[PDB]
Amino acid sequence: MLRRALEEAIAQALKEMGVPVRLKVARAPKDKPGDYGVPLFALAKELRKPPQAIAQELKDRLPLPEFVEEAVPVGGYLNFRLRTEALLREALRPKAPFPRRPGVVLVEHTSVNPNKELHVGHLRNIALGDAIARILAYAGREVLVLNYIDDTGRQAAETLFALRHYGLTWDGKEKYDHFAGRAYVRLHQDPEYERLQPAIEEVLHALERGELREEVNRILLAQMATMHALNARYDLLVWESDIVRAGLLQKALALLEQSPHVFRPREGKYAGALVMDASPVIPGLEDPFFVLLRSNGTATYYAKDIAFQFWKMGILEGLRFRPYENPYYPGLRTSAPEGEAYTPKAEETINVVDVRQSHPQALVRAALALAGYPALAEKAHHLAYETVLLEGRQMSGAVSVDEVLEEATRRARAIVEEKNPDHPDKEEAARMVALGAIRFSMVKTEPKKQIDFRYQEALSFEGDTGPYVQYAHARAHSILRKAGEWGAPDLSQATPYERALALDLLDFEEAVLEAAEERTPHVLAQYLLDLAASWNAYYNARENGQPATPVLTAPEGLRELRLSLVQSLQRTLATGLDLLGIPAPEVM
């Protein structure tokens, strides 16, 4: 790479001076001394010395990489001006996935109750999870995506009960999970809903015995059509009923009771209950006692989360897998009564979860440590996200994802009819634009921030949207289409326009790696907006009454240079878009 190669050379140089710390390089101020710079303020106080002195010091013991023209200590920072030729050369170089590093990173996302159609709240979950999974894989990690199916849940029991109680029969045409959702909705609007609890408990009991799996599977298959349309990928399916058969709960409980911090208080407000004292691993807690088993003997959700986490990291075994029959994913495997025994042996796990319906990371963290796995305790991550509104409306009093998809595809279709009335396949074009608008919207905003999805705004080819980035890709690609083949670029003919654009291209890999390391897809999304903006300003530039950056009319040497730069940009946008699950239309 370039930026990382620079940080590596700086780190190595910092060790030869004493301080074994690693500093991050970042784009230097707008039109200032250099292209990249490193701050020396964190060390300025950690060493009680003038920042400007540390910068000059670093400059003195830093062997310049061949691509660096000059290093300049600038008030606290040490800036680097790159050699234009090397800069261009690195910008033109093809960018591909990084070297593979062994060690499974298990990403769990989606995992919705299999009792009705998906809703907007589930959109962000899927988009965020799929994106981080794709980004991590590209960054070199061995990734596996798991979808947890709670087939024994009360929510599934309620819909199955409703379908029978109301004597509803599938018409054979309505999307099955929508049919189930209607039944669920009628049940909850029923005046005698409370009086029906005993009858619902009876179905719950049969459901818990694993006797209604096929009925649940019918709903899941229809939900999966939505997952597929959202361009999400899955490797494994794990069913709650299989988790029960595997005895993960009891095994986890038996392993935990070996700990001196896992015991049953003989008296107090926990008497008879099995509790885990997390204080020895988690300081500062009013009550460091997580209940695993209530006094009545009933297992807690915390105990079950621990059991499952243990299996994910190979601490426990019991789950068996086989091919999952479905029309969307040929390689998808599901847990089942019969199959090959398997554990992902994950080095790291990532759970994509709603900020509200979430459990404290402290739980599994402490459980992993107390069980004697302090290292793995630091590798159990959570990716919590905020609520998603539809047209400024909260969906908790609702619109299905399938409807948002159809309505967005509807509007996209109209947009493709006017901007390109002669487009060969307009439907495929509309699908890509709608999907891009949705996938990009769901991930461009920091997870901690709330999102308000508005159709027109999200679909606009002019705003900070997926279609905007897609259009920049199609524009760049159309130029290459018209150019045909071209020869060797003449780097010496580069103007400040080529340099500025090439430099933005040098930030792509860092955006990908930071997003992967921090588990923040929005960083990649934001980079793509910036790159698309840079490409547009570059394309639109004019001076003295004429285009200032023409490609096809540029003289020999310059034409080739611009074509290679245009190619690098189109490839970077196509690759970036793909990591966010967004297709890259060639014609728009």
Q: Where are the domains of the chain?
A: 1-100, 101-472, 473-588
Amino acid at 341: A
Residue 357 DSSP label: S
- Helical segments of 22-92, H only: 42-46, 51-60, 84-92
Name residue 101's beta-bridge partners.
141
Q: Which residues contact 533 (CB under 8 A, 6 or more apart)?
A: none
Q: What CATH fold (topology level) applies to the domain 473-588?
A: Isoleucyl-tRNA Synthetase; Domain 1 (1.10.730)
Instruction: Tell which residue, 145, 232, 143, has the closest CA to residue 442.
Output: 232
Instruction: Tell which residue, 175, 197, 176, 198, has the closest CA to residue 188.
Output: 197
| Chain centroid, CA 384 distance in Å | 11
Please tell me the distance from the alpha carbon of residue 581 to that of residue 332, in angstroms, as a whole number.
Answer: 18
Q: What CATH fold (topology level) applies to the domain 1-100?
A: Gyrase A; domain 2 (3.30.1360)
CA angle 27–33–34, rounded 5-degree value: 45
Q: Which residues contact 552 (CB under 8 A, 6 or more apart)?
A: 479, 482, 483, 559
Residues 224-237 as b/e (b if ≥16 CB within 10 A, e otherwise) read bbbbebbbbbbbbb
Tokens of 492: 């010496």
Contact 549, 497 (CB under 8 A): yes
Residue count (the chain): 588
Angstrom distances, CA of residue 224 to CA of 110, 329, 402, 469: 10, 9, 11, 28
CA angle 446–579–504, rounded 5-degree value: 75
Please tell me the distance from the alpha carbon of residue 102 to that of residue 516, in angstroms, as a whole number.
Answer: 16
Amino acid at 475: R
Please tell me the distance from the alpha carbon of residue 122 to that of residue 388, in angstroms, as a whole number.
Answer: 9
Resolution (A): 2.3
Amino acid at 490: D
| 545 φψ region: left (φ > 0), alpha (ψ -120 to 50), beta (else) | left
Name residue 107's beta-bridge partners.
145, 350
For the chain, helix (H) and strand (E) counts, in that order, are 22, 19
* H or E, element range at 37: strand 34-39
Please tell me the distance from the alpha carbon of residue 435 to that of residue 466, in angstroms, as a whole number.
Answer: 9
Terminal alpha carbon distance of the chain: 32
Assign domain 101-472 to a CATH class. alpha beta
Amino acid at 41: F
